[PDB]
């Protein structure tokens, strides 16, 4: 026998350690066969200027095509013949390259990764081959209404800030982008302390730490003159950006109010509140018997195709709300039932309700951590986000502190009378007027 709690306390702690330059070394051990070593660099899309808006994102395409030590196909053929998989993902705040492999392959793994971060053989040919490809990718991104709409939400959420640009990077910059510029970018932002080299599975921390090629380090200040935040707040703006295209079949709306950064008591409590609203699809087996009254109502009344609440965590700001897809004739009822669930949450939360949304959160947050790659991520990212902590076991404690009053007062700070940030892509003709959305944030009636 063994019980949830117990389990929790019995999970393998994460070892954070540090190289002379500030290379961060984490790892969770399990002594099992495949490993997923990763380097989680944290200079993303929000450091890019207007020009280099998609500079990082470009580096990514180059990341795996050569290293002075491995021109051409070397990288890949090396990864392949081992049977390892190599992925690059880039956000607006975090770039990240990682390797999945057999646990005995660390030797060559970690050497490869480290090689990748630093030496990237980039010729005029590869730059001009990657331009054409990203211009094509942009063209394909436009085909995506989810993507197109969430970009919009950031743009308008954060008008006139560096964080509202498209990771992908503004079309034409790609054309223009000077070859020198990639350098400056990397040089300036790939310098840990920023980066963390994390990993999970069968490895011994000890070795990891040791195995980190100590080759180049942060070329930065020792005093406060660095102190000028590179992470300067981004100004919060409650606008809408409506982009009508009656030629498209369905409607995409992203509504969110601004939230807190990565680190905050209120930020787990929010999750438990989104637990309650939920997330629903054309294919959910429970339709009408779902417990989230939003779900139930679109299930029952064919009100929507798919909706999903989200909490987009950033340093200086956030994005928090729902997103729904639906017919052109359904936009307003969807908007009604949604905001209505928000409001009823900050004024009428019941202990039963919060209690269920609590538990859900536990599970979402345990189940994601199944597997080596997920666990890597948690570790890597978790150290630029929340710093070095591994709050995993605390969670259940923190999660457990939620009496429904907690969930309700937390909820009202962000939602109640806050100006929502709205974005949709036609047919939006029925999408509420900004003033209607707004008064949808208080409760006189409706």
């Amino acid at each position: 026998t063994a019980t949830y709690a117990q389990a929790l306390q019995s999970v393998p702690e994460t070892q954070v350690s540090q190289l002379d330059n500030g290379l961060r070394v984490a790892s969770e051990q399990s002594s099992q066969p495949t490993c997923t070593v990763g380097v989680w660099i944290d200079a993303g899309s929000r450091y890019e200027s207007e020009k280099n808006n998609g500079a990082g994102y470009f580096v990514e395409h180059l990341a795996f095509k050569g290293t002075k030590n491995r021109p051409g196909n070397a990288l890949e053929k090396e990864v392949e013949s081992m049977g390892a998989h190599l992925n690059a993902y880039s956000t607006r705040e975090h770039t990240a390259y990682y390797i999945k492999a057999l646990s005995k392959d660390l030797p060559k793994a970690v050497e490869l990764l480290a090689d990748i971060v630093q030496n990237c053989s980039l010729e005029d040919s590869q730059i001009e081959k990657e331009r054409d490809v990203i211009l094509q990718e942009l063209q394909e991104n436009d085909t995506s209404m989810r993507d197109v709409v969430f970009n919009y939400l950031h743009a308008t959420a954060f008008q006139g800030t560096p964080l509202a640009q498209s990771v992908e990077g503004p079309s034409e910059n790609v054309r223009k982008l000077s070859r020198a510029d990639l350098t400056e970018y990397l040089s300036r932002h790939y310098k840990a302390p920023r980066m963390v080299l994390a990993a999970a599975g069968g490895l011994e921390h000890r070795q990891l730490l040791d195995l980190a090629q100590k080759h180049f380090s942060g070329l930065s200040g020792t005093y406060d003159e660095d102190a000028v935040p590179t992470l300067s707040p981004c100004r919060f703006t409650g606008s809408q950006i409506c982009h009508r295209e009656d030629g498209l079949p369905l409607a995409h709306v992203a509504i969110a109010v601004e939230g807190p950064g990565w680190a905050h008591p209120d930020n787990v409590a929010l999750q438990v509140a989104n637990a309650i609203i939920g997330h629903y699809d054309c294919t959910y087996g429970g339709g009408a018997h779902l417990s989230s009254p939003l779900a139930s109502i679109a299930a029952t009344n064919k009100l929507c195709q798919s909706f999903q609440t989200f909490n987009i965590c950033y340093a200086d700001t956030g994005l928090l709300g729902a997103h729904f897809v639906c017919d052109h004739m359904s936009i307003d009822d969807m908007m009604f039932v949604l905001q209505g669930q928000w409001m009823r949450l900050c004024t009428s939360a019941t202990e039963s309700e919060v209690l269920r949304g609590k538990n859900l959160l536990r599970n979402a947050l345990v189940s994601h951590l199944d597997g080596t790659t997920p666990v890597c991520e948690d570790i890597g990212r978790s150290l630029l986000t929340y710093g070095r902590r591994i709050p995993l076991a605390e969670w259940e404690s923190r999660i457990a502190e939620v009496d429904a009053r907690v969930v309700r007062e937390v909820c009202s700070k962000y939602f109640y009378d806050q100006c929502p940030a709205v974005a949709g892509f036609g047919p939006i003709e029925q999408l509420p007027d900004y003033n209607r959305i707004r008064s949808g944030m208080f409760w006189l009636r409706f």
């Binding site: 942009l138 063209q139 436009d142 919009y152 707040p233 100004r235 606008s239």
Partner: protein, 49 residues
Amino acid sequence: SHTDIKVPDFSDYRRPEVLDSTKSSKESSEARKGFSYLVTATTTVGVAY
């Protein structure tokens, strides 16, 4: 293509309190709701008379 989009300059229309490209508006706007609701409040109270 959809990325060459830029939200217009709103500086002219916005105000004092929330005009800071690089700073929080959350510790600004608290009042900015209160002034506007203050006008309502008054309006209502006068009209009541």
